[PDB]
């Protein structure tokens, strides 16, 4: 027998346990709101042929007027936002921002800081285990779209077990050729191209006929509660930006292709519902990081 | 059950048999005798 | 939390001993080695010194006793009296050494009572 | 609640001078720490919420009878607000001030064998915030300078680089260092109005939140109730 | 010899030893009082099509004003009550509610946390052991009414020993056919349908003739001291609600069909007198739980 | 192979589809509210040694002052309440009460006919099927506490499959002697007295050793949304009163021992979620019938 | 909506006289009548709510092209507010009033073969409420009088005990009987109880509440005719009169 | 010969034929406009620490004032939108929304029901059929990017015919190794990495040499007329939400991973010009659904 598992589901590293309280949640929400105004003010300044809208936005964000001979860095708010992002990723991060500094930055604007007002759909497909008998080869490639390639070399048809976990809401299976799939202790139906599955409905058995390889394409959707200001496009940009800037470069951590893979992998770890709340706050901070750094490159 | 001290837990701790000279001497002698 | 259970089956004897130490509370029960059904490894209790739970779950280490049941019982009775005035390491170290090495306790007063 | 309110090193040292060791020791039997448990957080999730218990939670826990247990009980009181259950310590020792235990040899306690790395691991230093860590390092420096272990404290800080950045800038035995110190050590203060009466997911965060919300009520009413029992003593 | 025992009396798991002081008892009583106000205010709010009665009661209960964006779950008072309930059920459940929060929530209302003002009657029948000879089969079924089915295949009549726990006050036995029951070393009376027994007198012996089986139906009544606010109907509803929500899902614990089985089983274990006091406080806490969840519904 | 099922789950008759709108729901709520005052008026009469509290309560309920000549019947409200109870039980029962009369009676008191404010716990144990192999006898008896007696006369141990449905939340199993139970495709644990199960988990297999019979006692808890005024003690008493008064004597209907059995049987029928809402309204109507008839026997 | 608001026999028959058949017929495709379906009721349940569609729902359904479907569309319009999809009936039949189809031989429609029991079963008389059954019985009596089938109508009432008790009392040829009749036939109206903007579980109940809430809006709308305040502005031909007689009655 | 086709193109189930008139199109546009106000008001409530903006927008959407202890679901407007969405997906889904309800809701806001003001680009790659000789193997995976793996085991080079349909505008073919592709009855060009193709040009022939397998990656772009308010990101999020909630669980229907796959599959079926009009209204309805549920969440 052989076991195949998704690459991104392996060994999720522990996440930080700091800056997750109500006061720190408001600061991340404050940074996101003020960073958005920086982007809008720069567009207004360019159109109006006046730097007055940008000066107000920078002064609110950085507590200092812009200067031609001083580099525009975002002030102490930028440093605090950078440091909390490092802490969220790993427990080994320093987490040196004082509580007095966080509290004073949350008073710049009034926001609830609630991280459960809305939801977001995550597309990463979690194949926890694919169990295949002898004389069969199974390969799993991809995260957003998982392609499972199976070859049957033996004499007769083989049964292959698929485990999609208990967290994902729905899973769609599509095959290169029609195939048979059924739950445990259930009769097999007539072969068809597309199957819609509920991952909580036990493992699924796939009949693999001898001959040409069968390829199954898997797509999944999972809903995770997120704040109303969450924007997946901006979070994804911030995640890529943070890796290139070295904010995630700590010892004994795992690296992912996208924030989609990061949040799903931490969800599937043992006691993973603890980590999912911290990952959402990290995503919001990355949304603030992307807007702030695009407006004030360094 | 009364409160537990740390006396028992220190006894069952592993020891450095190589770094300690007395422990190394003893295992060389037994290996020779065997 | 530290708890320890000793079950002694002396091959050279007719009686067995069960010693339990939860923290600094020591209890023992002497049991007969005959008349046992296949269900349980212990016969009827002949001498009681408290309540001992043999269903405790943990790592099991097998050892061979180097003293008789009378010698083991003598130290157990003495250790019960000095349970409050001795540390857990001393309570264990003296018991293990006598059972496994036939080494008499270094404490002279404890040695006399045994 | 009083100890968590101090925000300066000289306030914290002054409080420890007037506080007996009895206040740092709980008479509640509590539960054994380092236990993986499932707790109920119904404001957020329908399912039970995984968490692990620790000594630096706000709830009293069973403590060991050794000297290590007593030092851990003192630090937990400073960083979390509650001590641990160590029974029958002694009337004479319990009357002494907390600072007397940490910084004086007349108490009769020996702390030379303490390993600062082991104590930090037992207190889950990885889960402590910056203010809590600074308070813990203050207790280590006081213990180190009493025992003549100044070098060991410095070497211990070199190994733990993140702890070195937030190390308090005071030398025990020198009054000038305490006067000019500018550290912020207030875990609990008058809340910013934005704080709401809402639960938190973690055990530590919820217990810290409980102390924060009840500080305003405690501030107004503690003086009269303390005096109602203090007079005619 | 064969031994048969009641299923629910087997291995009672230890109960919690925390939150049993005078201050914690006041907190449970305050929660019950404030939950009763909450359930009454929801009725008034529904009748009058106004949120004024419910806002006043919820603010008293949760120390916070209801908000449309947020979710109404009871606030910090609900969080403490649910977590203390788990602590009572098992010693493996942790104690995570600080004493500052317990003292704060007990000051909301002025009540006396006395759990021994009144009494309540519990109907679980304890059959500690039934001893039968080799050639007899004995089966015990049921907790509220225990039906003991006995069949004798041997040549001679068999004597079967019935041991009821020393705690129960009265046990009433009714048989499908008349039978003879008497105390140990006492003369056998004529066969009759019904017997009234006090378990403290001693073990009982039942004579089984060879032939058709005899079924004995047992009912018991035990008085346990409870606070005046105790309501068995509300306590039973809260016990099933807590089980369905997963509050009692703790490692190495036993599960029971009703609160009556739980309190009687814990009474019959060693240190039962100490255990019953905690169970009574858990009963009041479950009464507060049931009224709180019914007032604030989650689909 | 033999199949055994619960007697009360067999062939639930269709419930009525009338008098389940907002207007009729407030009529049942008003009747429950005004019948409660009818009972409470008797206690007030004793305190004042006067019949004027009862006269006031009867006049509001019956739209007419009570007379010493005739027996108190309750007037138009009693006639309307009796007829709607008949219609709820069976679809064949006529819907004879006009909407205008329901309209007028619902305006007497201010109520909201919302039947989803709260929940109630129903204790009927659903055993859809018990599958047993040959040479084994299985007998299912009881509704509140289901006793399953199993005897095998074969050479070896037999496996018995238990199916508790998908509606019930918690099922507790207690055996006369310790036994082994596990889900499909799971290892079998050591013999244990008490099992806690969730019916959604799946079919359960019980090892039945050869020898003395094994009896398993089953208790179940199901949560059904009910109005805040629901009182199970009064609903159960009203169910017995209606059955004795001949309000359920219609052709091709099934009869049940308690409202507990009635509501669970319709729940487990095909498209059973439709019947639950109608049965809940019938329960509130029976609660009003119990109080009204106890104050005014006929 | 307007047909459901009529509360007396005189108003119902007066409305049917001025309403052409094309109002009964619907030109929306709808769906097949008898199907077990799952609908979404998110106010109450997370799962889909089973129900069975029927011809007396307020939404148009597909109808048979025979005469049986035409009569069944007329009754569904009267009792539910909407008809069914029967296209290409013809200009001559569609321009006639509903009363003319039900009562007059000059229309050219032959309906003497109709079976009242089968029509009632197809319309799900068991699911109808008291007002709905009274309205359908009015349609049956008008059809019986047109075809000289008065005896058959009485026997059908004798077989169905609940229908006999609520059967309206009027002779389909005499106007004096219509004026005397005091049966309340309103399905929608001003509600004495508390009416809220909340959904109902079944298709029939939810669709009925939409008309009830729509009628309240219609009552306060500018399209509604207020007899008390604007009686003089009404045209004389359609003004309310005490001596109002249907033609030929 | 062996024939291979894309999985998502196979057997498109018929779409609904109801709620496609001007009145229903106005209702969907009104719902989308009002849902956008609902999501913006909730943001404003967070920034102002006041529930007035959200209560203000919920009243317009649901025609009811929010009350505590009652779950906010969207009122009658949510009921109509959810059930109309089901009817658009499949012809087997019932039509249960009255015309009086559609007309009333369509009058809440002034807006046009125009669904052909603008256009959008869809990236599903239509591979109707791939015809291959006996000694070759062809496998097609993917919808947004289609990888066709071809292996030749015969003695000589084989010709594979590619049919991309007639609907897609441009198809870009990229190969793992340079390969030759030409139209029917056209001389083969030199080996190239990439080919830009017009699907209307006709069937395309690919020379597959003997040896290592050749993988061809296909990307396609098509233009479909959509209203100006169309947002692809919002439509796709609503499609996954509708699937999770189970609105698309109807008998004898086909399930798609994305709305891009769904609209392309219906386009390539017979009478696809009529089907694509209904799908566009469904996409706008799903955009309204996505914004409505994100404003009013359920745990």
Numbering used by the authors:
A (entry chain K), F (entry chain F): 2 to 299
B (entry chain U): 25 to 58
C (entry chain W): 287 to 400
D (entry chain Q): 1 to 233
E (entry chain H), H (entry chain J): 2 to 300
G (entry chain P): 1 to 249
Quoted passage from the original study:
Banna virus (BAV) is the prototype Seadornavirus, a class of reoviruses for which there has been little structural study. Here, we report atomic cryo-EM structures of three states of BAV virions—surrounded by 120 spikes (full virions), 60 spikes (partial virions), or no spikes (cores). In the full and partial BAV virions, genomic dsRNA segments and a number of RNA-dependent RNA polymerases (RdRps, VP1) are packaged in a double-layered icosahedral capsid consisting of three proteins (VP2, VP8, and VP10). The spikes protruding from the outer capsid shell are heterohexamers composed of a VP4 trimer capped by a VP9 trimer.
Visual inspection and 2D class averaging of purified BAV YN15-126-01 virions on cryo-EM micrographs revealed two types of virions: one surrounded by more spikes on the viral surface (hereafter referred to as full particles), and the other with sparser spiky density (partial particles). The ratio of full to partial particles was approximately 3:1. Icosahedral reconstructions of full and partial BAV particles (at ~5.7 Å resolution) revealed that they share overall structural features except for the different number of spikes on the virus surface. In the full BAV virions, there are 60 spikes sitting on VP10A and VP10B, respectively, while in the partial virions, there are only 60 spikes on VP10A. The thicker outer capsid shell is composed of 780 copies of VP8 and 120 copies of VP10, with each VP10 molecule being surrounded by six VP8 trimers. Two VP10 molecules are identified in each ASU, VP10A (closer to the icosahedral fivefold axis) and VP10B (closer to the threefold axis). In contrast, in the double-layered full BAV particles, 120 spikes made up of a VP4 trimer (for membrane penetration) and VP9 (for receptor binding) emanate from VP10 located at both type II and type III channels. The binding affinity of spikes at the two channels appears different, resulting in detachment of half the spikes when the partial particles form. BAV entry into the cell is a highly ordered process with stepwise detachment of viral spikes, as reflected by the variation in spike arrangement on full particles (120 spikes containing VP4 and VP9), partial particles (60 spikes containing VP4 and VP9), acidified particles (60 spikes containing VP4), and core particles (no spikes).
